[PDB]
Nucleic acid binder design. Structure first.
Ligand SMILES: [Zn+2]
Ligand SMILES: [Zn+2]
Lengths: 390, 42
RNA sequence: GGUAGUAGUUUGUACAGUUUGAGGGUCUAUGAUACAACCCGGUACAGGAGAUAACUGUACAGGCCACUG
């Protein structure tokens, strides 16, 4: 009688717990696994489950997570060294205002095209506009055009010139992307309506929060190291990484970024915000709330922000459990929006119909991302020369 | 060669053992109140 | 444009159970004994459930080649 507990006591060391009451989905089964999420019916079955390769492969990961949680708190000197290291990393590889001015001086190419076509649709877009990367996401100029015209013929005629002049090198046109594009590295994709609406927000945040740019830049550099940034060949969309950072700052206990919607709203019904629609920024103010600066400035060492971000995305919460969104500070379940659970859920504020990040369906890539996150956390948190930074 | 883990019987090993888990027994004194390492009279 | 389904042939993971090759004692021992059976044993255990590869069908995530209500 009493000894029976000892028999399951061993099982208690592998995170195996007997069901308090019978579960309707598995009536026969009487056991559960915290890590594997599998039901069992007999103690012999539990012991067999202990021998499972995946059970131990997850037990080792749980032990590593526990070890990471137990790391000693960072010292002030280590924090300062890490902060200066992140500042150096951001400034060395960061698009500065001079580079953005050089890129703007797009105007010459617009002048060239205007001679051919009376109506020319050119607008700066991508990493240079946001200053959140160095030719990583939406490199150079990605254009947007109204839908009143016909995009295909426009694309053909505009690419005609870039192909005609022999001065340019390696000019092709690819239509395999979500929108037609021409490379000469120029990008011409007419019909965009929401991408500019998002880069407007990203540019607006550039100077409203000084620490926003360096943190997103460091995250982009780390993704480039890990190869997760590239949308093609799997991974996670390159630009949405910035949004990822925006989620951390927004979900941090002391927020560094105001909420896009919900900060000021009337008749707020959190059940569904699909009807609500946003618009372009208005003098760096809150996005259109008809149907982005904190009241008090926040300034903390960049190393502390980096450590908090790593803890948030590695040791704090389960990535699959909740979606990455910036519309509302409140956490939203994935099943509420009917989104898949295999792909990492990232939602840009201006479009909630589909997941922006759908290239992480492969579980191998997700496991690689998680293990790289853990490796980065242990590399940075543990004391090392120059604050344990690249 | 070794007693069954589940039942403490040399007849069958744990994998072959089919009976449900039952209180452990101290081999030295044949008492389930304590284990072999904690036997008082040993 | 949105939900769902669709013959094989393909995708990466995990997998009831079925079969090779590698596995763990070996030292703790007198003696037997045509191809006519059996073996003394000081120097052993702890609370501990014990292996890798080719088949066999399978819940998952999107497609090959695109289709249907
Ligand atoms: Zn037994
Ligand atoms: Zn005893």
């Amino acid at each position: 009688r009493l000894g029976l507990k000892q028999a399951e006591e061993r099982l208690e060391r592998d995170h195996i717990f007997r069901l308090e009451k019978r579960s309707p989905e598995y009536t026969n089964c009487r056991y559960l696994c915290k890590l594997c999420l599998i039901h069992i019916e007999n103690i012999q079955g539990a012991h067999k489950h202990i021998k499972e390769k995946r059970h131990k492969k997850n037990i080792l990961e749980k032990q590593e997570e526990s070890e990471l949680r137990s790391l000693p708190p960072p010292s002030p000197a280590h924090l300062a060294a890490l902060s200066v290291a992140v500042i150096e990393l951001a400034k060395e590889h960061g698009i500065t205002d001079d580079d953005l001015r050089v890129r703007q001086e797009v105007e010459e190419m617009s002048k060239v095209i205007t001679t051919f076509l009376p109506e020319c649709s050119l607008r700066l877009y991508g990493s240079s506009l946001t200053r959140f990367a160095l030719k990583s996401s939406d490199v150079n100029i990605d254009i947007k055009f109204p839908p009143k015209m016909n995009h295909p013929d426009l694309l053909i005629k505009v690419l005609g010139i870039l192909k005609k002049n022999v001065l340019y090198v390696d000019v092709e046109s690819d239509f395999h992307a979500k929108v037609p594009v021409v490379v000469c590295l120029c990008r011409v994709s007419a019909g965009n309506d929401m991408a500019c609406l998002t880069t407007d927000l990203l540019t607006a945040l550039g100077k409203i929060e000084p620490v926003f740019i360096p943190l997103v830049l460091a995250f982009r550099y780390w993704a480039k190291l890990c190869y997760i940034d590239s949308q093609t060949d799997g991974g996670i969309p390159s630009y949405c990484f910035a949004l990822m950072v925006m989620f951390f700052l927004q979900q941090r206990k002391p927020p560094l970024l105001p909420c896009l919607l919900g900060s000021w709203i009337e008749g707020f019904d959190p059940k569904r915000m699909d009807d609500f629609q946003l618009k372009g920024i208005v003098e760096e103010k809150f996005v259109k709330w008809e149907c982005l600066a904190l009241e008090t400035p926040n300034r903390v060492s960049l190393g502390q922000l980096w450590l908090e971000l790593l803890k948030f995305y590695t040791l704090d919460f389960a990535l699959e459990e909740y979606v990455i969104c910036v519309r509302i500070q409140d956490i939203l379940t994935r099943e509420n929006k009917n989104w898949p659970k295999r792909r990492i859920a990232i939602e840009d504020p201006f479009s909630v119909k589909r997941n922006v990040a759908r290239s992480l369906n492969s579980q191998l890539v997700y496991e690689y991302v998680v293990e790289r996150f853990r490796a980065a956390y242990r590399y940075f948190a543990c004391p090392q020369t120059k604050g344990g930074n690249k | 060669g070794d007693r069954c883990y589940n039942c403490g019987g040399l007849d069958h090993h744990a994998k072959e053992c089919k009976l449900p888990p039952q209180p452990k027994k101290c081999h030295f004194c044949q008492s389930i109140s304590h284990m072999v390492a904690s036997c008082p009279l040993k």
